[PDB]
């Protein structure tokens, strides 16, 4: 998993940031959304109800970035193309 | 009503003209501290604003891409350059301008 999570971004389409993740969930192009332990649910329960799967990450948005190669923090990380990976299978 | 007898200012206008030219303003005429005659925050503000405007105009006209602009802006904020002339001299010496 330690390498599958990296390869999901190394050889896969993802969009980082809550705004773009919510847009991807709204328009359906995202296979799923990965959310950190600190992300609220006031807007997120709607995308939970929607057919877009919601994966929960084991750590905060601060440390979700370094494991996905981003120097910044990531809260919502909707994926577009799984690519050379089965992160969707890992989620559900 | 008798005419107001003012205070004539011609012999101060002549001195002001000389002072504008840069005379009558030597060390034997200075009496306030260097800092009371030229505040250091004002000096820094004018210097940094000139450098920042120069960098902005360069990035606008396309001689300076964002990667080197960031470093040059931080250099200017760190005081590496005396003035716009110094900044331009460094740019032309190290070929930072995207000449075409």
């Amino acid at each position: 998993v330690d390498k599958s999570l990296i390869k999901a971004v190394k050889t896969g389409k993802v969009i980082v940031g809550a705004n773009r993740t919510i847009d991807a969930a709204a328009n359906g192009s995202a296979k799923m959304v990965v959310l950190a332990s600190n992300c609220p649910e006031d807007i997120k329960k709607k995308i939970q109800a929607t057919d877009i799967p919601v994966l929960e990450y084991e750590g905060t948005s601060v440390e979700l970035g370094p494991v996905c190669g981003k120097p910044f923090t990531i809260a919502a990380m909707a994926i577009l193309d799984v690519g050379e990976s089965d992160i969707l299978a890992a989620t559900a | 009503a008798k005419p107001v007898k003012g205070v004539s200012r011609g012999r101060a206008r002549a001195l002001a003209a000389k002072r504008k030219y840069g005379h009558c303003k030597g060390h034997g005429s200075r009496k306030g501290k260097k800092g009371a005659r030229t505040p250091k925050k004002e000096q820094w503000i004018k210097k940094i604003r000139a450098l920042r405007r120069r960098l902005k105009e360069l990035r606008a006209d396309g001689a300076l891409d964002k990667s080197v602009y960031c470093r040059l802006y931080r250099k200017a904020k760190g005081g590496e350059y005396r003035s716009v002339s110094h900044l331009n001299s460094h740019l032309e010496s190290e070929k930072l301008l995207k000449k075409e």
């Binding site: 600190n38 905060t60 948005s61 601060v62 923090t73 | -």
Partner: protein, 94 residues
């Protein structure tokens, strides 16, 4: 990145505002407390070092606006962390 830490300048720290007054011992105590309080403190809500003291015992996160009550000069105290870890151990046990 920091000041000109001269060959002799690394003792007074923020207590250099006091000059030769008040004694080395109290100057050192105040300087150490200032250093500890001005150190970065991680927000328990967003997990990033943006917690600053807004008043005597009030601490606020500049990012998420999370404001809370902590120590006078430190956002988190050893007694409070001990209480938190005791209750966390109980919660894990049950």
């Amino acid at each position: 990145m920091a000041k000109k830490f001269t060959k002799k300048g690394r003792i007074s720290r923020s207590a250099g505002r006091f000059g030769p007054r008040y004694g080395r011992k109290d100057r050192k105590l105040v300087a150490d407390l200032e250093e500890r309080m001005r150190a970065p403190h991680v927000c328990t809500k967003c997990a990033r070092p943006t917690v600053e003291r807004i008043g005597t015992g009030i601490w606020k996160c500049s990012k998420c606006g999370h404001t809370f009550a902590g120590g006078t000069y430190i956002p988190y105290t050893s007694v409070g962390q001990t209480l938190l870890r005791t209750m966390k151990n109980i919660a894990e046990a049950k």
